[PDB]
Design a binder for this molecule. Structure first.
Ligand SMILES: [Cl-]
Ligand SMILES: [Cl-]
Ligand SMILES: [Cl-]
Ligand SMILES: [Cl-]
Ligand SMILES: [Cl-]
Ligand SMILES: [Cl-]
Ligand SMILES: [Cl-]
Ligand SMILES: [Cl-]
Ligand SMILES: [Mg+2]
Ligand SMILES: [Mg+2]
Ligand SMILES: [Mg+2]
Ligand SMILES: [Mg+2]
Ligand SMILES: [Mg+2]
Ligand SMILES: [Mg+2]
Ligand SMILES: [Mg+2]
Ligand SMILES: [Mg+2]
Lengths: 332, 332, 332, 332
């Protein structure tokens, strides 16, 4: 049967930290932490399809992002500045001259949760209240995340939010995928004809450039390591992939594959930000993960070159809705 | 036919007090009072499945909770305090050092009502306006309760609300179930692996504890009286069950049974607070009910240990929606 | 075919006054005025089922109510006063010591309109903006009325509204029905066990009274004239029927019949206010209508005895929705 | 397959200008610019059905309107004044004594965009944030435009918006149609019995006039050039058609035809404003288009004679929704 359960493993911020398991009748078990509404593991016949830390306890010892619901804004904001009309709002500069990842972001907070299931799905709904002014963002914000598993081995991620003030909001699920192997060795096809080259600060500075003729061309199936180990100046600059790709609208958004498994990625986001875990090195808390072991498909609106953030602006009471679907299937 | 009617029996607060009857074609009659949007009786072939007072008039003579729509917050709030950001709001201390049951709560107000029916349901919709600042709660609040009976002997309870200010809201239906017998003698199975132990003040103080190895273990069908008459320190502390149970997500939330009847409880709440009518003693207005005659399944977000009430916070204009389904069927 | 059209006949308030015709394939033609979103005629095989003035031009010469969308509040408000919390708002005293019919109400304004049709319906949607403070009511208000005709000779009336401020709103469609004859001679059955007796000022003063044993008993089919010509003190007081009836929830709300036609009335309102055109006398602008020629079924929340108007209070941005269905069929 | 793609061709306002192509399996390709959410081309078996500039780059060199999403208000506002209650708001006088086309309107802004497709549709969703006070309009505004192509050669246009302040909003899609020929030579049938004659300033001054007996009568199929070359005083005044037509509600709103093609126009707007490109003259940036080469069917609420703009007033948080459907089919 489709079923759910959870176990409490710790306390943080006067709240319980739990590990929630969703199971189906098709060989899949999904593990979620209410800490950061974090996707911890995706087990297909016992094999983990994503990067995970050594233990659930490890996730809250420091900020390592993997699996997390990162907000209020995932990625960078130039000079931490948001201009609307003749007004500019200043966000905290936690990334040198810029702002990144919401400051002390939502991936670091303990969310409330509620598991449920029916004849078609096993799911967990998570909620978080973030007060007006937290990390200098305007608006009381209510966030709702759902991870929902069906019998077709599709894991659906839904992230909804509402603010009571004009604000900016562009969160992302920060899961790294490896299909039980290493992302460097995996094949990728992606329906994106353009990417955003970035500057030394890691932000776009000239809008879209064609992927054609560059390391970023995944229009035809290509080994990820071919891009990572190329002499491409943008790859060298960011020590691997660390780049927004602008989707062309054809389905699926991305298809990641090994000889044994395939992952089909779909989303209502306009972009995928691909980061190949360029900084991992088998040390510290994350000693079980090395460089290029996993790759994100961060489904969000792309980071912007400057203070025009119209795309990610929410009116008071406007419903934000992000969907991502990760479908796991058998290889060729 | 599915049908409705009502009778006026009294006046209170310059309004009429009525008793509304919903009937189906499957042997069920449900009686509702617009006073407190209160579930008065659930008759299955003439046999009452819930605790009821001697007469409808008795419900409004004093606060005895049974059947009532208790709000704005059912249960306790530590120190009556709600912290959001750097702001704390103080609620009335009607429970010693703490706040309980909304002060002069919604179970004590006269709601407006409207019966209706169709080929599938007989229902009554009830509404209440609670002004900003009543019982020191922020926000004008509009509440809508519905009791809806179908031909499958399911009684659906829907409780919706909206506030025009940032506020806190966690109401509950306070029906006590007995299946025409005494709850102490009934069997219970409940899909909850954790409960919240409470302190001397009746509030949680350490988050979840496993039900395994305690009186609170209803994972396998167990006579309620076995828990009530056990030497468990938490049972002794609260003179019986008076505890939040955190649901594991598997269906149903609870199954209460006698040899003759079963009640299947489903809800979109994350918790059930179980209270076994520990204080009843066949005296006063409630002289027809004794200790442990009935048990609640209060479907709400759980009472919290402190002033972090994020789970029950509503933005202005945010729709709150609680569902409970009580399905009555024949025994084994 | 289901079809619509309109003709312009006059100018008022720098706007065009039009008469809109909805037609079906089942012998029905419905005439609507954008002046007051007014139901002008309901023609079944050429025979008018409702009271109408001599000409469309007559409707805007003075306030005669028939067919009109009367708001913001249809009927009386005691002392013109609305109490919410510790605040009381004062409405204009256009009814002696009381307020009635919204002051210079929405039945006196020129609405915008748009006809449309499809394979199932012919309809006209009408809209009106009423500014904050008009007739001393709070809130900018957007009203939307729809008259929609199908091939089953059902005319659906939908009235929706939203305010940007906490406010009170209880409009009604003021159509008088006669089935091409005189209402005094028609039979009526109504699923209401209670009515609200009124005082000398025409307002309720003691809540519900049983219809049983009074002129107001239409639980079993009865000639309307039997009530009108009875010695009942409430009938004498109001010179006929002028009374709220509280619906019991069984279907339909009312059934009005002659030997040739029947009208089946359904509504999502809790009450019908019945007024038998007690003041008409074949004089003035309305010289074609005499006493008791038609009867309203004003589907609204009932007039209240005092300043507690919780039932009709709207939060800012709360959607009000009233439906009425008038189905015309062949007699027995 | 239904498919989408886009190409970047320029930069403007620190954003990329792209040309988005939607294609189906029925011979249609639609080209959209994110600059002004502009409909650039509609190709049916290689033949363009609408007016287009020489190149996508031409659209942003100056304001020429064709294809554009023109807002916040398309068309004129008398004296630039909006009266609500006792308040009047003043808009910029960019049209002599009047206001027109939103000032520096939304057809001149770079919108964000996202293509997508499925088994039934190929679409592009575009969004724009317009700050409070831009062009002296109140309210932060979020606009969403969608162009959606199906396999029946219907192109659907959806335009939605929400403001956080009481405001006025009446945008339009400004596509000119020619069916690969010249509009002057095309036949038109239109289900509108009334038009709004205009004054020297191009605004209505007397409400509706019958089309019967005038050049504006398209109730029966008529060559557009017959109206354009007539001696009608309103045609002479505006150098061709430049007039609101008020729809009668029968389907379709308009049918434009050549010997080879037909265009079926449907809309939820109450009016179509018809402008026959009266000013084009094969000079300047638009040197490829001459007088009467194309005709708009601007689906909006009609321009008003004065400061009563109730029809186009939006409450804060009220959802505006315009639909237009353009279906292209084979001729007779
Ligand atoms: Cl801006
Ligand atoms: Cl490494
Ligand atoms: Cl907080
Ligand atoms: Cl006892
Ligand atoms: Cl009140
Ligand atoms: Cl008379
Ligand atoms: Cl006004
Ligand atoms: Cl020319
Ligand atoms: Mg601060
Ligand atoms: Mg390694
Ligand atoms: Mg106070
Ligand atoms: Mg006893
Ligand atoms: Mg005033
Ligand atoms: Mg007469
Ligand atoms: Mg300004
Ligand atoms: Mg030419």
């Amino acid at each position: 049967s489709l079923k759910t359960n959870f176990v409490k493993y710790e306390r943080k911020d006067n709240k319980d930290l739990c590990e929630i398991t969703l199971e189906n009748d098709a060989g899949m078990a999904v593990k979620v932490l209410n800490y950061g509404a974090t996707l911890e593991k995706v087990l297909l016949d016992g094999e983990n399809m994503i990067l995970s830390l050594n233990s659930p306890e490890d996730y809250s010892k420091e900020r390592n992002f993997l699996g997390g619901t990162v907000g209020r804004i995932a990625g960078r904001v130039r000079a931490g500045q948001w201009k609307h009309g003749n007004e500019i709002h200043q966000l905290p500069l936690n990334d040198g001259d810029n702002h990144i990842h919401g400051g002390i972001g939502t991936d670091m907070h303990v969310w409330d949760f509620r598991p449920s299931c029916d004849s078609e799905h096993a799911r967990v709904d998570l909620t978080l209240f973030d007060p007006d002014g937290n990390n200098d963002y305007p608006g009381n914000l209510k966030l709702h995340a759902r991870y929902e598993l069906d019998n077709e081995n599709n894991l659906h991620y839904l992230l909804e939010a509402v603010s009571d003030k004009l604000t900016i909001f562009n969160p992302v699920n920060h899961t790294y995928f490896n299909l039980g192997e290493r992302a460097e060795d995996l094949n990728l096809q992606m329906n994106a004809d353009y990417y955003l080259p970035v500057d030394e600060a890691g932000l776009p500075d000239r809008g879209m450039a064609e992927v054609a003729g560059t390391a970023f061309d995944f229009r035809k199936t290509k080994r990820i390591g071919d891009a990572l180990n190329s002499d491409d100046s943008q790859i060298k600059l960011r020590n691997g992939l660390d780049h927004p790709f602008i989707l062309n609208g054809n389905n699926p958004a991305a298809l990641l594959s090994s000889n044994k498994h395939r992952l089909i990625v779909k989303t209502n986001a306009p972009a995928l930000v691909l980061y190949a875990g360029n900084h991992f090195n088998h040390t510290g808390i994350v000693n079980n993960i090395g460089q290029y072991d996993g790759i994100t498909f961060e489904a969000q609106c792309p980071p912007a070159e400057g203070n025009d953030l119209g795309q990610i602006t929410l009116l008071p009471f406007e419903k934000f809705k992000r969907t991502v679907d990760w479908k796991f299937e058998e290889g060729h």
